[PDB]
Design a binder for these strands. Structure first.
Ligand code: A0I
Ligand code: MG
Ligand code: MG
Ligand code: ZN
Ligand code: ZN
Ligand code: ZN
Lengths: 513, 425, 417
RNA sequence: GUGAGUAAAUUUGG
RNA sequence: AUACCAAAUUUUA
RNA sequence: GAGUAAAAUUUGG
RNA sequence: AAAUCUUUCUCAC
């Protein structure tokens, strides 16, 4: 049916593909492509564009954003038990804490200063050295990412070492800063739609638009290119160390370590790779492997092709195309006058995940559609009514509800089929507030979150309810935590209060006027 | 003894690391959401619970009623500038026994952009999902006229046209090295020490507005006072009211580093900067100094360098436009040389062939402005020699857009059009 | 406020007391000594004199309020301060030389920098690689899509029946007969019966892919919603017959045969054999007690079942219908058939897309969107975006790709763009 | 590798 | 030359 | 088992 | 047996 749409349609209505396959095949394929590129047979990974005009940031103070170094996302931790190497998946928080424990350092910034101020690669920084950190920081673990529409073969992703992440955060922060200072039209922080609007304005002075994509982007970004950019902007020894670890990277596949001298392993440095092109020319509006340049004559198109080749931004001949009436970037398509292209576009369907979460997600999707020009409002109302009927078919059995109140949704035993306009303009029974996109969490979300919470060790003393002005980079010991908690509790008791009363900004503001 | 296990070998850790280590874990269920909700009748029991106890306590929200006529337009970014708690207010809430972490999360001013293709006559902002139906966020005639670029009925005062200062209107102005705030009743003076706005009564409403405009923390300082003060005379004097919507701070410039505020008007509820009003806004503050009203994409220093480079070669009109843009983008009081007459000319900014600046999502080629495009003559680029279906014919004075021209029988794209940017009407 | 001075500040407040016991100097960098709810205006605070103190170096002012007292650490070893008391306190307390480390900059050049640069130089480097020659031509024509579909058909061919796709239509049996047929088919297949449920046991695997062919399209899919809901319910309800209003299925857990000590209940990873019923008339016919029906199987993993069961057929159809050109009638093999084709077969195609857990039709749709938007494309390479047979394996995804290409061809045939 | 048993997904969706 | 945190959800590379 | 990066919504702190 | 290295439950030794 997507083939018979009159307008633009990505085909996002169904869910993305699923896969229970092992990640070995995809990771091996990626490494093989990188190796093939290294031989100079398929694509270009040798950067020849001039980057001498990028401003030097070497004089800036070395600052580390601590929050970027802790998360519940996965990472690879490396242990050398008996001369062998063991790579295990852990949280980035646990990996960073283990790193800081091994090299006795209060904070990551202290660790980076210590690493930068030693006088030998063998000098100890605790139970380790810079040589050992570089050896361990080049090890990656492989995994599979699925549920991405249009990719029947899911993509290989890689968990990196905490030390690698620590250096990457610094270099990427400074690459983004240089992009903000040097890019003709800054886009590293804009959304897809904002990028499309800016591109529409940018390409309005030339006849032809090159809707462009790059292929094998991460496999064709070489350690030499990364070091070239980092030296151009002045990352010094941090950049040298990161490039060295990238050149010597090894990926654990199943039980074997496989060397991958080429590439950067699936988007490890998006801003640096973007700067590799943006630092040589101002003719492209791009981030990562997506650019929307324009041209007037075939000679200008040849110039564009040469510029892309020289920056290791190999044009994807499968997907790149030339257009004159439209322009598309980041899957957002606009007409040359800035209008959104008629059609469903990127509109995605809502799968069945609960009686009320399904309706709330449908409401959010339809609100997004109608705020743009995707569909008229009455179509959205009809679709919402149809969704309510489908939810009634799915969820109106005793295993979900035993109620018969009139105001309830028909999918919960009621007889109310709400109008989209009535719901949106808070013109409904309060039971429906949870279904409004801006409303509070629905009953299903609370139930599922409770189920997730009740799945179980020993907790550290909580360090909540802090003074909102205390910087989070300050240090605390166990006794400090105990003393701070005791003082706060004493102050609360002086106010005749139990646990601090939850503060809702909206509610509190509503009491102001 | 969990501290000695989680942080073995260390006695001190940052608050960030400790808090990240005290994060509760969530285990993803292997069942579908449907089966999870069915398990043990958890959702059924929760629905009973909610209908019996939680639902009656839910407050009733007001119903949206205000609508305006809207028309389909280009895809634009609707900008909402939601302010966070002020520093003193956060201290007051924390010392009152409220959650410190929640208060900290509400301390930061947020700016969000939402795509929308629908515009009203007065560039109103719309409720989520109701732009097509024209439900506006906005809800005394002088209050209504103060927020309008062109008030319907002048009242003989500054809010609604040229005139002097009414009682409900206050102003904040800069004299010498001090900020004078006058309401008609109370006159106060404030200074900037290091990162604080020190004043006798920071709780003063005009003082709060000034603190928000200068990006400073209010502070109580008895020993702040000024020597000369024309606040009475300027309060009794009459100033021209530039035709412009209120800046995101809710104020309107009336003189060099001086802004008028209305007590009942908190923050701008309409798009301050748009494609049709950008150049008028720039011209209004030509010589009023930095305004800090329009956000620039990228680096402010780079944008000022590009503006200076274009300014170095241009006619007086283009020079005035460039200075107005520089004032529009420069924050008030910060370390910026927005005046494009004392700023140093950057050679690298001259090296580049095209000088682009993005203000509130509008991309402007300063080179095009220098040769008089957005205000004098439009730019025409031929797209094809075939007539495209569904496109209107070329008007005599076309605005921006795609048209079919019969005079040469071609599809033309019009950009940088005075019919879209100047719009003298 | 700068962390560099933190330790220095701590030395300044060294067991100094006031008011008979209370600490005098409170360090801004100390989390315990900080006064909660009080903004910081210096490195430390003197409670006795109620004054903020900051420490500065020569020619290095720090951004603090003017009311904060500055203790200037002169280049020559001396500590100047407007307040004499703080001067004496600094003189005594900074008895040991407390040299403040300089600010480390991002471009800092480490001692081992040259060593690592040499190491990098000795390691392998990429070779230049060839510059592609790009010819920009018109997008592919109808003949190219026809060639792709013909290539798929020639290489794989067609099954004789629609197999599980036929389960989108009523088998013409009552609930009792459907349950009887399903249970008796399970018995005849020699499935283990345990605890009132069916288990399919396996011992060895050939470790080769199953035969792949294209599925012919049934006439219609009136039971699409019912079938998807049944698959959704089978995610945990496996081993017993599940009934809907107009049809039924049987999901059998597939577990290994250890022989004596074997798995007896499914776990999160156990696969299912989904058995469904359609009208007879193929090699899969099964008869019992005079009741006849075609029995078709589908081997799914848990993720595939969960993904399939969650799709909303009706809403997807309506959303597509919102802005759809007229759909032409098509034959069993996705060919334009004005005389005898059926427009309901499009529903069947939609159902197929719902059943395909790889959703290759999404890749085809994205490439076709690019095709319809394109004025010029790269010669011989853009055409090589519809060749997705190497990305997928199995009858269902192969048929989905084939009918997606057929949809593209039909669009180019009946509604040229 | 040997032996033994049969918490978790069936309870409860037309 | 320089000059908010997590959980869930949607989209995007 | 699910990484890097961007935008946004809700909830919690 | 099939969309085929997946269909890999527990306990003691
Ligand atoms: N989920 C994602 C998606 C994209 N990315 C980055 O985006 C590049 C291009 O992703 P793509 O899928 O487009 N493949 P790419 O090799 O360019 O080839 P293709 O265009 O398919 O021909 C990748 O390399 C990564 O850096 C990522 O990190 N995570
Ligand atoms: Mg692209
Ligand atoms: Mg690509
Ligand atoms: Zn008035
Ligand atoms: Zn005054
Ligand atoms: Zn058959």
């Amino acid at each position: 049916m997507w083939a018979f749409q009159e307008g633009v349609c990505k085909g996002n209505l169904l869910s993305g593909p699923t896969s229970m396959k092992a990640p070995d095949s995809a990771a091996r394929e990626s490494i093989d492509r990188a190796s093939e590129i290294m031989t100079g047979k398929s694509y270009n990974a040798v950067h020849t564009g001039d980057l001498s005009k990028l401003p030097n940031q070497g004089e800036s103070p070395l600052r580390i954003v601590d929050s970027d170094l802790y998360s519940e996302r996965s990472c690879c931790w490396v242990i050398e038990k008996e001369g062998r190497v063991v790579c295990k998946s852990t949280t980035l928080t646990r990996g960073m804490t283990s790193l800081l424990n091994t090299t006795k350092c209060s904070s990551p910034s202290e660790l980076i200063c210590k690493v930068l101020t030693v006088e030998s690669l063998s000098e100890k920084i605790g139970d380790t050295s810079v040589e050992e950190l570089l050896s361990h920081g080049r090890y990656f673990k492989c995994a599979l990412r699925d549920q991405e529409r249009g990719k029947p073969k899911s993509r290989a992703i890689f968990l990196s070492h905490p030390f690698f992440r620590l250096l990457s955060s610094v270099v990427e922060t400074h690459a983004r800063s240089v992009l903000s200072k040097v890019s003709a039209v800054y886009t590293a922080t804009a959304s897809a739609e904002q990028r499309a609007m800016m591109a529409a304005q940018v390409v309005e002075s030339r006849k032809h638009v090159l809707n462009g994509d790059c292929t094998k982007y991460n496999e064709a970004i070489d350690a030499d290119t990364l070091l070239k950019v980092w030296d151009a902007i002045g990352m010094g020894s941090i950049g040298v160390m990161l490039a060295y670890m990238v050149r010597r990277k090894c990926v654990l596949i199943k039980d074997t370590l496989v060397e991958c001298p080429g590439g950067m392993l699936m988007g490890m440095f998006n801003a640096t790779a973007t700067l590799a092109l943006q630092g040589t020319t101002d003719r492209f509006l791009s981030f990562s492997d997506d650019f929307i340049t324009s041209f007037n004559s075939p000679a200008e198109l040849r110039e564009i092709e040469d510029l892309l080749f020289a920056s290791c931004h190999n044009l994807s001949l499968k997907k790149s195309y030339i257009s004159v009436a439209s322009l598309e970037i980041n899957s957002c398509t606009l007409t040359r006058d800035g209008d959104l292209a008629t059609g469903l576009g990127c509109t995605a369907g809502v799968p069945f995940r609960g009686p009320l979460v399904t309706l709330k997600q449908t409401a959010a999707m339809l609100s997004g559609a109608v705020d743009s020009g995707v569909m008229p409002f009455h179509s959205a109302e009809r679709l919402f009514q149809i969704k309510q009927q489908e939810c009634a078919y799915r969820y109106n059995n005793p295993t979900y509800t035993t109620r018969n109140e009139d105001f309830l949704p028909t999918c919960l035993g009621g007889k109310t089929v709400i109008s989209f306009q009535s719901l949106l303009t808070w013109d409904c029974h309060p039971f429906w507030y949870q279904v409004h996109p801006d409303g509070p969490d629905t009953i299903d979300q609370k139930v599922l979150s409770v189920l997730a919470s009740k799945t179980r060790r020993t907790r550290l003393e909580a360090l909540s309810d802090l003074d909102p002005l205390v910087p989070h980079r300050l240090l605390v010991s166990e006794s400090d935590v105990s003393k701070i908690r005791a003082a706060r509790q004493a102050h609360l008791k002086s106010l005749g209060l139990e646990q601090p009363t939850n503060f809702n900004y909206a509610i509190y503001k509503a009491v102001q006027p | 003894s969990q501290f000695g296990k989680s942080f073995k070998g260390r006695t001190e850790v940052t608050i960030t690391e400790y808090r990240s280590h005290t994060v509760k874990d969530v285990h993803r269920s292997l069942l579908t959401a449907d089966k999870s909700l069915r398990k043990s009748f958890c959702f059924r029991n929760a629905l009973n619970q909610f209908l019996d106890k939680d639902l009656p306590l839910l407050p009733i929200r007001p119903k949206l009623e205000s609508r305006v006529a809207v028309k389909k337009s280009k895809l634009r970014s609707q900008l909402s500038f939601r302010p966070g708690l002020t520093q003193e207010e956060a201290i007051d809430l924390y010392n009152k026994g409220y959650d410190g972490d929640s208060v900290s999360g509400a301390l930061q001013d947020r700016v969000v952009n939402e795509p929308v293709a629908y515009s009203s006559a007065d560039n109103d902002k719309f409720h989520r999902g109701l732009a097509a139906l024209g439900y506006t966020l906005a809800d005394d005639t002088c209050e209504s006229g103060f927020v309008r670029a062109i008030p319907t009925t002048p009242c003989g005062f500054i809010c609604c046209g040229p005139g002097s200062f009414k009682d409900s209107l206050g102003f904040v102005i800069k004299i010498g090295e001090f900020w004078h705030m006058y309401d008609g009743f109370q006159h106060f003076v404030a200074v900037e020490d290091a990162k604080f706005l020190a004043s006798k009564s920071p709780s003063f409403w005009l003082a709060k507005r000034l603190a928000k405009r200068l990006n400073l923390v209010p502070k109580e300082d008895p020993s702040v006072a000024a020597a000369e003060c024309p606040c009475k005379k300027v309060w009794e004097a009459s100033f021209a009211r530039a035709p412009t919507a209120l800046d995101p701070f809710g104020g309107r410039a009336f003189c060099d580093q001086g802004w008028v505020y209305h007590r009942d008007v908190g923050y701008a509820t309409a798009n301050h900067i748009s494609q049709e009003t950008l150049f008028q806004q720039a011209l209004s503050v030509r010589n009023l100094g930095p305004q800090g009203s329009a956000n620039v994409s990228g680096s402010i220093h780079t944008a000022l360098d590009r503006l200076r480079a274009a300014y170095s070669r241009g006619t007086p009109a283009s020079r005035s436009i460039l200075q107005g843009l520089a004032n529009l983008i420069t924050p008030v009081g910060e370390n910026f040389e927005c005046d494009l007459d004392k700023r140093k000319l950057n050679i690298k900014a001259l090296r580049s062939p095209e000088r682009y600046i993005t203000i509130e999502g509008l991309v402007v080629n300063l080179d095009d402005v220098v040769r008089g495009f957005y205000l004098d003559k439009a730019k025409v680029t031929v797209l094809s020699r075939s007539k495209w279906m569904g496109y209107e014919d070329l008007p005599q004075k076309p605005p921006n857009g795609t048209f079919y021209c019969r005079k040469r029988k071609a599809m033309l794209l019009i950009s940088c059009s005075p019919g879209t940017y100047a719009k003298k009407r | 406020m700068d962390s560099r001075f933190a330790q220095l500040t701590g030395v300044f407040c060294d067991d100094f007391t006031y008011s008979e016991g209370s600490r005098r100097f409170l360090s801004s960098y100390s989390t315990v000594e900080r006064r909660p709810g009080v903004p910081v205006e210096g490195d430390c605070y003197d409670c006795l004199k109620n004054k903020w103190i900051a420490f500065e170096l020569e020619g290095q002012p720090r951004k603090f309020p003017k009311a904060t007292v500055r203790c200037i650490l002169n280049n020559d070893a001396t500590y100047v301060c407007s307040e004499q008391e703080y001067q004496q306190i600094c003189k005594v307390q900074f008895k040991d030389y407390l040299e403040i480390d300089g600010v480390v900059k991002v471009g800092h050049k480490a001692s081992y920098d040259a060593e690592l640069r040499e190491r990098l130089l000795e390691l392998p480097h990429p070779k230049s690689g060839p510059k592609p020659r790009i010819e920009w031509v018109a997008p592919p024509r109808l003949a190219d899509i026809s060639k792709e579909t013909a290539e798929l058909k020639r290489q794989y061919g067609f099954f004789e029946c629609s197999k599980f796709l036929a389960c989108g239509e009523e088998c013409g049996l009552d609930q009792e007969a459907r349950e009887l047929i399903l249970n008796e088919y399970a018995r005849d297949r020699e499935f283990e019966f345990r605890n009132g449920g069916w288990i399919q046991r396996y011992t060895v695997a050939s470790h080769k892919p199953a035969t792949q062919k294209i599925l012919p399209l049934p006439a219609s899919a009136p039971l699409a919603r019912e079938l998807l809901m049944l698959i959704a319910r089978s995610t945990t309800q496996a081993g017993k017959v599940l009934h809907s209003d107009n049809t039924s299925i049987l999901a059998v857990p597939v577990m290994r045969d250890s022989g004596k000590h074997s798995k007896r209940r499914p776990t999160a990873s156990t696969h299912h054999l989904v058995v469904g019923l359609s009208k007879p008339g193929c090699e899969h016919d099964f008869e019992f007690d005079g009741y006849r029906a075609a029995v078709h199987v589908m081997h799914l993993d848990p993720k595939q079942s969960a993904n399939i069961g969650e799709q909303d057929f009706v809403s997807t159809r309506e959303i597509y219908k919102l802005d759809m050109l007229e759909l032409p009638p098509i034959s069993r093999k996705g060919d334009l058939d004005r005389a005898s084709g059926l427009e309901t077969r499009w529903d069947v195609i939609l159902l197929l897309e719902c059943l395909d857990s790889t959703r290759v039709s999404q890749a085809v749709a994205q490439h076709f969107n690019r095709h319809r938007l394109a004025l010029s494309v790269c010669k011989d390479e853009f055409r090589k975006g519809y060749q997705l047979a190497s990305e997928i394996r199995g009858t269902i995804p192969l048929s989905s790709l084939y009918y997606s290409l057929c949809a593209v061809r039909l669009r180019m045939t009946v509604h040229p763009f």
